[PDB]
A paper describes a structure:
HLA‐E is a nonclassical class Ib HLA expressed by nearly every nucleated cell in the body. The structure of HLA‐E is analogous to classical HLA class Ia molecules: it is composed of an α‐chain with three extracellular domains, comprising the α1‐ and α2‐domains that form the peptide binding groove, an α3 domain that associates with β2m, a transmembrane domain, and a cytoplasmic domain. Expression of HLA‐E on the cell surface is usually reliant on binding of leader peptides from HLA‐A, ‐B, ‐C, or ‐G molecules, typically with the sequence VMAPRTL(L/V/I)L. During normal cellular conditions, HLA‐E presented leader peptides prevent lysis by NK cells via binding to inhibitory NK receptors (NKG2A, etc.). Here, we solved crystal structures of TCRs bound to HLA‐E in complex with well‐characterized peptides from Mtb and HIV, demonstrating divergent binding modes akin to the differences observed for TCRs recognizing distinct pHLA class I complexes.
Author numbering:
A (entry chain C): 1 to 9
B (entry chain A): 2 to 222, 225 to 276
C (entry chain B): 0 to 99
D (entry chain D): 2 to 29, 36 to 59, 63 to 68, 74 to 110, 113 to 206
E (entry chain E): 1 to 29, 37 to 58, 63 to 72, 74 to 81, 83 to 111, 112A, 112B, 113 to 256
């Protein structure tokens, strides 16, 4: 399954 | 030595709306889910037979997760564009690769995340999963940013706990296909290329997983091997050939050596006329 | 910006024998950026039954796609894969060899 | 994500310490934020605790964060009447793109009435009219004003007013009607 | 700098009417949010934005649209006003959601009331009541009482004006309005406020006292053909002088 948060660069 | 990995791709298309966004999920070397935002009300969908029995609660969650990632990656494409002093006219490619690996014991072994901008290593997560290595000086601003927000914290929690838990769930749900070791059906083909030279091509067909080692040796002791990239047969299995240019008449001097998880002992082939 | 050219393989799923149903595959890999046009051709004419695998990529961030269609190879008929990419100044065609 | 604030309403005498609580289902948050809302006004941020941080102190306010437990505690040391307001709790949602809020804890810090002198007075209208209104005032802060049952007879809830000029606080409640058989003496029973 | 500005502060709508709630910030904040607040439900995220041209829906987005054409502006559009959308709407912005600089700033808020019939809208009648002889005698303090009666909806701001200047001290207005007919669901409201003051100051006949109620009713756009003066947004004031 996918992680809930995507890192912001 | 299993793994659950995802491959995210965002492509800025300025003046033609929001960027293109595609996610694909892999267990070992088997794609099981996919998201494509290039559609009206786009959704995460099953792409393995063994994934269709999951409830709509799963797909609704995966949909929202993939939707929010697309939205974040749109912002990221804006930010990175700003860092490299690039035009708002060009198309730019942000790629995100994350996954967890299980050890022999079947417990968490290791996690990794990496970013790439325009096909080039940008920002790698360290093996401690608590900090980043900005591969470029432009990614230093990003590194400082992801540390201020404790971004690695949430990725560690996913990679160590959530990722490992669901990898186990998938390996059970798809066990009949995922845990099956299909060994390569292997043979040798002779292709004359000139008067003096011929080509011995060592085949490996319908093997799974994708990991395989093909090498040519000579009785006594060779030319540098041509090794084609491992390709999908389109049925869940893989194909690969290794080719070697040899002097014609001297073909039965060369042996092919195959190594695969599905082979108890390494197989040796030799071309018979 | 660093742009890599598509590596093109055209091949059947199973060892082809004339007048037996098989699957024609065109594997395009090692290319950047993602945007690519791929058609499978019977006798130089475009095939409209064509499906393709979802966009993924390798350790070096280079994209790969599997284009494929169900087909019955014969003696007379010729199959190829036409691929156009920003790296190619001219659409590139690769004939299906049974021995590659 | 769901954020719960326990209790919903709190009433404490002035000078006393009090805890406002806030718990959240999802521990994977970036920031927790406490806010103040005065009636008919917007929200003003009081304290911001990062996921990495544990304490944040602002005068008589100390907020604490236990990511594991999934709760924050706002300690209000030696409460004053000026604290009487609504306090809301908020964490970063699953996506991490906006704040999700709790119902909030409606706080009432009752003023200490030095010398209570409970009295009911009658007031005539400035524009004649034979219009009369009852005023219950100078009563102790602990007593709650019983609402009138009688139809078309109206009684307000109490409010405290500050006469800084004379250093004097006094509670106050009002009652009135359009009837003729309406006396102020035994109107607040 | 003004922080976050919202317009209007009060608005009355008929069911089916559309309108745009204006919100702007001059702080260059990339993140902006719209919430609604109704008793015992708390702040419910309607819509949110993470930058110019990027919008998404929250907990309860149905009935509303948003646009983030510019970093500066985040308008909220009610397409077809319904009674259920009667609430208080707050616009909010912040430099960051995930970063250390995550202080979120809110607007002064918009009170919205949607009605089937604008007929049921009346303005407040205000009357000031002079202090009790007994109070001056017993305490040597004088409590004036302001009473605003028979207004709808709950869209009023009561204040006191001693010698033509707004007093912020010696006052308390009731925290809640009061239902004149608790039986009815459309019932008009009643509000009371106390101004206490030294007996000496009340006794001085040069002291001017006035309680005023700013009522926010209908705009000049709103249609009105009822046999009655249109209940427009207006100030209604009662007053009294000092006396020995």
């Amino acid at each position: 399954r996918l992680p809930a948060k995507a890192p912001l660069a | 030595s299993h793994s659950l990995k995802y491959f995210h791709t965002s492509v800025s298309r300025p003046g033609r709306g929001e960027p293109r966004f595609i996610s694909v999920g892999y267990v070992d070397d088997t794609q099981f889910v996919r998201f494509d935002n290039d559609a009206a009300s786009p959704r995460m969908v099953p792409r393995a037979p063994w994934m269709e029995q999951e409830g709509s609660e799963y797909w609704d969650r995966e949909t929202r997760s993939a939707r929010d990632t697309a939205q974040i990656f749109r912002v990221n494409l804006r930010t990175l564009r700003g860092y490299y002093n690039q035009s708002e006219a060009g198309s730019h490619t942000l790629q995100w690769m994350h996954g967890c690996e299980l050890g022999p014991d079947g417990r968490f072994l290791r996690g990794y995340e990496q970013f790439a901008y325009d096909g080039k290593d940008y920002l790698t997560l360290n093996e401690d999963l608590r900090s980043w290595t900005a591969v470029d000086t432009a990614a230093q601003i990003s590194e400082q940013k992801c540390n201020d927000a404790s971004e690695a914290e949430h990725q560690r929690a996913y990679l160590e706990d959530t990722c490992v838990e669901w990898l186990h769930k998938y390996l059970e749900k798809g066990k009949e296909t995922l845990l099956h070791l299909e060994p390569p059906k292997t043979h040798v083909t002779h292709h004359p290329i000139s008067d003096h030279e011929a080509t011995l091509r060592c085949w490996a067909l319908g093997f799974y997983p994708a990991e395989i080692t093909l090498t040519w040796q000579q009785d006594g002791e060779t030319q540098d091997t041509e090794l084609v990239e491992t390709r999908p047969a389109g049925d869940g299995t893989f194909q690969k050939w290794a080719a070697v240019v040899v002097p014609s008449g001297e073909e039965q001097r060369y042996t092919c050596h195959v190594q695969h998880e599905g082979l108890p002992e390494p197989v040796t082939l030799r071309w018979k006329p | 910006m660093i742009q890599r050219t598509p590596k093109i393989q055209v091949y059947s799923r199973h060892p082809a024998e004339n007048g037996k149903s098989n699957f024609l595959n065109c594997y395009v890999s090692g290319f950047h950026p993602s945007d690519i046009e791929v058609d499978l051709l019977k006798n130089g004419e475009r095939i409209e039954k064509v499906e393709h695998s979802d966009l993924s990529f390798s350790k070096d961030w280079s994209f790969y796609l599997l284009y494929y269609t169900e087909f019955t190879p014969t003696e007379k008929d010729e199959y190829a894969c036409r691929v156009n990419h920003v790296t190619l100044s001219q659409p590139k065609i690769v004939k299906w060899d049974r021995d590659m | 994500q769901e954020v719960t604030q326990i209790p919903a309403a709190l009433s404490v005498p002035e000078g006393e310490n009090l805890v406002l609580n806030c718990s959240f289902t999802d521990s994977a948050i970036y920031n927790l934020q406490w806010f103040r809302q005065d009636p008919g006004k917007g929200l003003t941020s009081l304290l911001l605790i990062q996921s990495s941080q544990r304490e944040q102190t602002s005068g008589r306010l100390n907020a604490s964060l236990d990511k594991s437990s999934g709760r924050s505690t706002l300690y209000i040391a030696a409460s004053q009447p000026g604290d009487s307001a609504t306090y809301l709790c908020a964490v970063t949602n699953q996506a991490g793109t906006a704040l999700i809020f709790g119902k909030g804890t409606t706080l009432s810090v009752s003023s200490n009435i030095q010398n209570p002198d409970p009295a009911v007075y009658q007031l005539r209208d400035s524009k004649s009219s034979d219009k009369s209104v009852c005023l219950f005032t100078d009563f102790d802060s602990q007593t709650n004003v019983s609402q009138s049952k009688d139809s078309d007879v109206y009684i307000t809830d109490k409010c405290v007013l500050d006469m800084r000029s004379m250093d004097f606080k006094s509670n106050s409640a009002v009652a009135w009607s359009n009837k003729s058989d309406f006396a102020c003496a035994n109107a607040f029973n | 700098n003004a922080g976050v500005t919202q317009t209007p502060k009060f608005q009355v709508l008929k069911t089916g009417q559309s309108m745009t709630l204006q919100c702007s910030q001059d702080m260059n904040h990339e993140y902006m949010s719209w919430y609604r607040q109704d008793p015992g439900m708390g702040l419910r995220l309607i819509h949110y934005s993470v930058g110019a041209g990027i919008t998404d829906q929250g907990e309860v987005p149905n009935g509303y649209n948003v646009s983030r054409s510019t970093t500066e502006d985040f308008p909220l559009r009610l397409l077809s006003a319904a009674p259920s959308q009667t609430s208080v709407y707050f616009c909010a912005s912040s430099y960051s959601i995930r970063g250390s600089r995550g202080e979120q700033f809110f607007g002064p808020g918009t009170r919205l009331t949607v009605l089937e019939d604008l007929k049921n809208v009346f303005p407040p009648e205000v009357a000031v009541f002079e202090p009790s002889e007994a109070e001056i005698s017993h305490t040597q303090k004088a409590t004036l009482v302001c009473l605003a009666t028979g207004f709808y909806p709950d869209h009023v701001e009561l204040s006191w004006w001693v010698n033509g200047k707004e007093v912020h001290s010696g006052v308390c207005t009731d925290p809640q309005p009061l239902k004149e007919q608790p039986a009815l669901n459309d019932s008009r409201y009643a509000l009371s406020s106390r101004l206490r003051v030294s007996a000496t100051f009340w006794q001085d006949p040069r002291n001017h006292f006035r309680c005023q109620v700013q009522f926010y009713g209908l705009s000049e756009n709103d249609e009105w053909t009822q046999d009655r003066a249109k209940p427009v947004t207006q100030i209604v004031s009662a007053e009294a002088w000092g006396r020995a």
